[PDB]
Amino acid sequence: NRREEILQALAEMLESNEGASRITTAKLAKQVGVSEAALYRHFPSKTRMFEGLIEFIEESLMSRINRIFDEEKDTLNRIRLVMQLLLAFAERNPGLTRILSGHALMFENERLRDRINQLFERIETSLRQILRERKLREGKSFPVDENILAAQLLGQVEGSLNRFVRSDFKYLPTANFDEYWALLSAQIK
Amino acid sequence: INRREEILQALAEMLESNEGASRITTAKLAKQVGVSEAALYRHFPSKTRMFEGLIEFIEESLMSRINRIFDEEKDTLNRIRLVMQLLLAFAERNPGLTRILSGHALMFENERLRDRINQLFERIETSLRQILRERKLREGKSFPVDENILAAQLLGQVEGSLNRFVRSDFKYLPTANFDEYWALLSAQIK
Amino acid sequence: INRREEILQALAEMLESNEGASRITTAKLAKQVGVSEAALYRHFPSKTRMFEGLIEFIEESLMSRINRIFDEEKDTLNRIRLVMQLLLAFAERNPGLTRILSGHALMFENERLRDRINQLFERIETSLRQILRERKSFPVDENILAAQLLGQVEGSLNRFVRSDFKYLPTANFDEYWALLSAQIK
Amino acid sequence: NRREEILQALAEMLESNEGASRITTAKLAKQVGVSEAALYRHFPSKTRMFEGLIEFIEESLMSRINRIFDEEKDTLNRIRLVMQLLLAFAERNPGLTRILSGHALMFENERLRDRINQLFERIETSLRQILRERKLREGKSFPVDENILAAQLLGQVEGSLNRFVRSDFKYLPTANFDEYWALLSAQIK
DNA sequence: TTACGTGAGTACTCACGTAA
DNA sequence: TTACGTGAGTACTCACGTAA
């Protein structure tokens, strides 16, 4: 549980207004209430601390993506749920969002970006999968090719999250989601 | 100035390389310009001002062409098309500056700078809101939702493409698939 | 304690040496302790705080000894003799710290520190002003005599510093006080 | 006049609040009106700039002191005059006073401070000389040794100078000089 | 786990060059 | 004399190291 106390505090730091700046191992140490070397007994480096946060984000998102594939069998509903999950997750975890948008990683090992790109590739592939199953489940397909649309949907989400982090979390992603979904539906249907 | 511009350029170039993902120290920048750190401060009071100048080029260059589009293109639908097609093309020809546009390169500098870029986006979205309201009130195009929701999605695709351009180390072109994207975004406002 | 006190000791030591006539950089101060520059910052947030640590010691030492003079010596003229003596003896026993009282060492540091030393002298002069009202002898003005007195002392501290610590502040104090006390009744 | 224009400028900055800190050549150039390369074709180093200021002070003061020996033949009056001359010069030159007390010399080459110690030595010798001539002139000497007395008199002056610069030029050196004198003569004579 | 600590860096400064 | 510098600092920071 100790190993989690660290990742949880690191997450709380990124959420606060301090998350906009470099989270020093000393400041992180003050949140956990332990010494600096007390952190380096669960994590070889600072980068492993982020690598663990990233894994968490991926775990939540992909798991829930799959749950939707089993729970819901209607194509449009599937896209709706995934779009909502992505924006809602970002809204409940502003600090983790700073890692998804890649701003918090600016101060860390530039290789962590590979994990971020692999996470996005999983979301995209998942999105693409849902769209492909339409002609089979409904007979109809989409105006644009599945790959293009998957990328288009993923782009709107990244853009939406970049604004969230940009505005200092003032611009909420899920606020007006219903009207937004109604817009996509009229576009995708 | 000659040497003054050599600085800004040196910066933009570094922002394009793989170093753009990490902090650009004055030591590294000085080397890239082939001068001493002191020479740097002779053209700029602080590292921040150096970035400001780049942002100044972005604000001017973008607001320049956006104004030209209004005096030239009058059709509300195509103006909206050219607006974002400009941002995507501008970012694609200025990879390094995109890191400023997405706000990643400005994490090592004064907050005040990021504000400068947030405003740049506020204005761009404000214009889109205008163009959409006119198309609705003058051409009676009954949208299935508020202009804010539409202008928000149009800006989302753009930022979505800027950030992904950065993620992939500039491998995924922001203008890629634009035409297809537009055929799905315009259908609800034609 | 162990290291925080060691640093303040190193700073005073350098302030006493020939290095005190020049800026005491952290690189150099760090070398005088046997540790790295980063090491200094674990006990002090700024170089300014290091100097405040010394200014506090100077204050605590001077003011507390002045309160002991009052409760031990009841004679007015002796009180005055003893206070001036304390100031000159303090500086003579602490060459480096005098470099601070004279204000030359603070030229390389935060302006607020010089503000502190002025505040300390006001205190000294005030307590010296109070004593002179216990009188008296020869049209005397408390406010004026107190300034002359603290002034004389201050002149002794600068002569001590600028003279590379050769002109001891307490030298000839007995003669100086002989002529003064006699004419001041 | 350019050489002098630099000296006045520097003198002026030493007289302002900036005098409390390092007077960079960059700023000295600004004040003068010319460039940094200009200031240097008139002065080899920055130390030559302060050296030329110590020279003004040295002559301003000794020439006056020698004139006193010649113009006044009463011992006490001779002492009164020199002490007044010293304090009066300081008061009229707040800037150069940051040099005499040595505070402004902390940013420059040590040599400059050894020269100041030479100046004070010439001053003290003057006093020590004026005092020795009392037995011959009046047949009476002082109740204290000429050395000790001289060192004490100059000390009062250095003290007044230190307070003047200290108080940001609020404590005037010539202030209440008359009271100090009334009590001094009373101690000697 | 805490005590005690540091190599490499980090934005910025200053008195003082030198070539045509 | 301009144009165009710079070697050596400066106070202060940080992720990660070593021994009890």
Curated annotation (Swiss-Prot), chain B:
* Chain residues forming the annotated DNA-binding region: 25-44
All copies of domain HTH tetR-type, residue ranges: 1-62
For this chain, the annotated S-S bridges are none
Database matches in PROSITE patterns: HTH_TETR_2 (PS50977)
InterPro entries according to UniProt: Homeodomain-like_sf (IPR009057), HTH-type_TetR-like_transc_reg (IPR050109), HTH_TetR (IPR001647), NO_SlmA (IPR023769), SlmA-like_C (IPR054580), Tet_transcr_reg_TetR-rel_C_sf (IPR036271)
Which GO terms fall under biological process for this protein?
cell division; negative regulation of division septum assembly; regulation of DNA-templated transcription
One protein family per Pfam: TetR_N
How this chain assembles, per its entry, is: Homodimer. Interacts with FtsZ.
Checking PANTHER family in the record gives:
HTH-TYPE TRANSCRIPTIONAL REGULATOR RUTR, NUCLEOID OCCLUSION FACTOR SLMA
Q: What does this protein do?
A: Required for nucleoid occlusion (NO) phenomenon, which prevents Z-ring formation and cell division over the nucleoid. Acts as a DNA-associated cell division inhibitor that binds simultaneously chromosomal DNA and FtsZ, and disrupts the assembly of FtsZ polymers. SlmA-DNA-binding sequences (SBS) are dispersed on non-Ter regions of the chromosome, preventing FtsZ polymerization at these regions.
What name does UniProt use for this protein? Nucleoid occlusion factor SlmA
Q: Which gene encodes it?
A: slmA
